[PDB]
Write a protein that binds this ligand. Structure first.
Ligand code: HEM
Ligand code: HEM
Lengths: 145, 145
């Protein structure tokens, strides 16, 4: 269950998540747009799902993409702040899961975000250990998809 | 015009928003649910829009309502964090505006949140001065609906 996935996040994993978020989460506009643009560059097949945002190749200049990207970073902020209470983490994860279930986004497709996250982390010198920690958090969401 | 509305957030207003947010934003789960339950109690006619959340009278016990409520508080956190840059404030406001336009929520009905905000603020010893400051921020979202 989603609870099982959340309940399994260990102290060391939460530590790595918080330490890396202190940095990547400090510039939500910049890193949020970077995450989205990287997803579009490496997984062009996903561009079609974001038609509401218009021309995503416009990057930072695209106000709709900018607003969406900042919002995405606050969903992550939410997750990070709820790490110590699985009950709360689960209810927020299920909420955002619905936002994607309605768009027909499968657990496998949601996992495509791992590549971009790994790259953004690396740009700030956070290695594989950190990317693995984030993959575990993403897996919590996948448990609800 | 959302841009003219955003221009109404003067130095004094921004200060009052930040000062009060430091207090109300410290307990997103508690105050978020308080905001929603107050809305449903004072404006019963809005409950119909929240069909997906199930029995909202259950309050904190309702997992869907708690998840929704926490999310709402992070939307407000987002707004507060963008007060420095009007261009970014507008793009995030328009993003959440879409979320409500799709639910057929008008500017007038969105404004029904002012009562709840004033009540929650009052319970924390923040009077009309602060309630009026928040009404100006809510007005920016209303201009986009
Ligand atoms: C770290 C992972 C991710 C997070 C935290 C996240 C968060 C969000 C948030 C907060 C929204 C806005 C929900 C709404 O207002 O309706 C959203 C929308 C959306 N997400 Fe994600 N998302 C993630 C990964 C993905 C991935 C990998 C895909 C695609 C393969 C995806 C596809 C979508 C789509 C299509 C929308 C709708 C955009 C629109 O039309 O406005 N998301 N996401
Ligand atoms: C401070 C004011 C408010 C903020 C910041 C706010 C924020 C939000 C957020 C972030 C969502 C989730 C969007 C999504 O995932 O689709 C949401 C959903 C919603 N909001 Fe608001 N909202 C506010 C006031 C209101 C008011 C006053 C009404 C109704 C009179 C309203 C009606 C709705 C409805 C119907 C939903 C959909 C809930 C669901 O089915 O999940 N909102 N709101």
């Amino acid at each position: 269950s989603v609870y099982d996935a959340a309940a399994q996040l260990t102290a060391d994993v939460k530590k790595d998540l918080r330490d890396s978020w202190k940095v990547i989460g400090s510039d939500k506009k910049g890193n949020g747009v970077a995450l989205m643009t990287t997803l579009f560059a490496d997984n062009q097949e996903t561009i079609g799902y974001f038609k509401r945002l218009g021309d995503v190749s416009q990057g930072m200049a695209n106000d709709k993409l900018r607003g969406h990207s900042i919002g995405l970073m606050y969903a992550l902020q939410n997750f990070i702040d709820q790490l110590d209470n699985p009950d709360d983490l689960v209810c927020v994860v299920e909420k955002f899961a619905v936002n994607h279930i309605t768009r027909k986004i499968s657990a496998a497709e949601f996992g495509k975000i791992n590549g971009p996250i790994k790259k953004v982390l690396a740009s700030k010198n956070f290695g594989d250990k950190y990317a693995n920690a984030w993959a575990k958090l993403v897996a919590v969401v996948q448990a609800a998809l």
